[PDB]
Amino acid sequence: FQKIYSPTQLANAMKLVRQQNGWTQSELAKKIGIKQATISNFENNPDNTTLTTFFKILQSLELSMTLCDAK
Amino acid sequence: FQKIYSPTQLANAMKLVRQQNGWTQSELAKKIGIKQATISNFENNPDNTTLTTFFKILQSLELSMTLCDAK
DNA sequence: TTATCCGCTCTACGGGATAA
DNA sequence: TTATCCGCTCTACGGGATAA
DSSP: OOOBOSHHHHHHHHHHHHHHTTOOHHHHHHHHTOOHHHHHHHHHOGGGOBHHHHHHHHHHTTEEEEEEEOO | OOOBOSHHHHHHHHHHHHHHTTOOHHHHHHHHTOOHHHHHHHHHOGGGOBHHHHHHHHHHTTEEEEEEEOO
């Protein structure tokens, strides 16, 4: 887990976690009451994705987040 | 820096960093080409805030973020 | 200094759903 | 399986700006 500085870097990182665990977009979506299309749009077009969607997808991936220095 | 699980927890944490450094919303806003109103709305109503706004405010606070296990 | 307002445009996200 | 579509409503975020 490296430091993340943009929505694109964030989406790429979270997509990788999903793929490394063999999870489909539908699995996660159904687990958190979100559309599959919303996850697809987050992974490919995260710039305008809301924080709510982000944190729900975080939960489905069994992940959390912390702040840190930009170094 | 604790683990964060929601937009509200995120906004509270980042607001605290701003206050601990004596920064005003206008200072940060001008540094990243964002409206002051956008920062105010993020700190008080973060649920629908876009990821772009979030990462821009992150930069102004000289912060970054990492993913981690939800434990 | 910050919460809050106006009027505008754009898009996310829900509801549907599909191709291959 | 996932990118992508339709039509809808809501709101964020830019442009203005204010009170105290």
